[PDB]
Every structure is written in C-alpha cells, then in structure tokens.
Amino acid sequence: ALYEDPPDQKTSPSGKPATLKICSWNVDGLRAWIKKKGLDWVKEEAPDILCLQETKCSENKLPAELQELPGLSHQYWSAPSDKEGYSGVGLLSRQCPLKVSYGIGDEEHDQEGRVIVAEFDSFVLVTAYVPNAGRGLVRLEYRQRWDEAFRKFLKGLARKPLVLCGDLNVAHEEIDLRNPKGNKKNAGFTPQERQGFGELLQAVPLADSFRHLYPNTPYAYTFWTYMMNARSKNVGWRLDYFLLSHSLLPALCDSKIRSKALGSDHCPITLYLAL
DNA sequence: CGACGGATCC
DNA sequence: GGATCCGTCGGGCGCATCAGC
DNA sequence: GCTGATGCGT
Ligand SMILES: [Mg+2]
User: Check: CATH 3.30.300.30 for A1-275?
Assistant: First the structure.
C-alpha cells in the first residue's frame, strides 16, 4: 500500500536526452509552503519551469525568497479578485515565454486566478487549479459547467502541441485513489467529474503522461488529506497531472510523483521531455 | 474524506 | 459470519477577519 | 502589533 516512485528516466523511448524539466505543485498556501521549506525542495529539483496552484496569495504578498531565484526569473502570478486567500496560480520559468495569458476567456471580468497559459518555442503550457465540487457536492454543477468551458477553451487555442499540468481535482479511475468505493459520492471522484476528465482527454485530445507510462501501477497518489495521518498510510488520491498532446508522446521521457517532498497536502509532480 | 457503525450478502 | 456496501460524523490544514489589549 | 477565536473552504 506504500509507494516508491521509480528512478527518473531521462531518455525518450528512442534514446533522446531530456531537455526540459517541468515541475507542478499544489502548495496549499504559498506563504505557508515557503515557511515549511518548499522552495528549498524546488532548488534541489532545479526545474526549467515551475507551476504552482493554491498560492492563496496576491502578488503584492509574495515572500522575498521568490525574488531570490535566478534560475526561475520569469514569474507570472494570478489571484482571484473577490476571493483572495483562495485559489491563485503561478508560473515560473527559466526562459521568457513568447506569450502569457490568464483565465479561460473572460478573466478581465471574471478574475478567477485559476489558469495561466504560456506559449514557448515548441509548445504551449497551461497550468490549472480546477474548481472543487465542494463538501456535499454543493458546487458540483458549477464544476461541470466549468469543465465544459475549459474543454472548449483548450480546443479553441489558435498550432503547437499542448502541455496541461496542475491540480485537475479528479481521480480519473479507481486505480487513482486508495478508497474508490467509499468516495463515489465525494468531490474528486463523482461519475460527473470522472466523465468530464475522460471528455477532456478525448475532446482536445490529450494523454495522461503518468498513466501512459505506468498504466497498471496502483497506490500512486499526489494528495493526502491532512486528517487521520492519511499520508503516513498512503491513503491518497492522484489529483495532479501532466496531460500531453499525442504528438508529444515520442518526446516523453518520464512523469514523476515526488512522494517525499513535504510542505503541502499535495506532493510535486515532474515531467521530463526530449524537445 | 477516512473512520466508524450498522445492514446485507453469500 | 467474513466481506462488502452504505450513510453519518468529526477534524487537519491555511488564510481573512475580528475582538481585545 | 500581536495573539487566538471564528468563519470559510475543503
Ligand atoms: Mg487543497
């Protein structure tokens, strides 16, 4: 029931070396995460691009340590206007993106701080913090409408292949969480969110990088509730993903789950691409 | 949301 | 009568606001 | 300014 992520594979199936390392992390409160040494772990991981979710932090409140990152000097931040202290995403990059945008169509009016889009030379990167269905599923219908708008937004992008990463807030299949049967009526594992995920993969279209490499591997999770010592018992959920355009699969070296990195109730995930 | 109690099924 | 299904319930976290001093 | 309570989301 415990899990050990396999060693990093830094070579593509055809023998090409990885050239791009992307790390994604739901940090559950950026200021808290930094106090718990999250940035020390980022420095050790040394990614080319770092995507963060649930920053819960407007840009003016960013800790100074974030200014002290020479290898991640291009930084883009989004926080909601009417709900500061919740949501918020960030994208930090070694190289400057060609284009950066926010939201999924109307962010200038519906300032939600959930999505950042960055176009690079060879690919487009989207990072997302997908809305939670909430306790008792009170916001499930909103989540379903959001999924539909997100799907259409990703499909409606004006060429290059897509990388989508972040907290998509759903365990796609039973293998993606410890207690599938007890959670069928809970946020993150309803038939509605599971279906929205399958529709995301088919509509865009996208592949689940981790599952593509490790289709039958159980007990691989990226989230554990703080309650009941769930993490120590690896009672968790896989909520964080790297979804790729089909054309990027031959460039895929590995998709990692960094189970040991502490500082949040999610752990980091890391992608290696040979571009 | 995992732990728990209580019902139901071979 | 062990395994399974199902509904209910308490509670760890971070951050905003507030009361008090 | 600082602490701890409460509310909210989860
Ligand atoms: Mg969270």
Answer: no
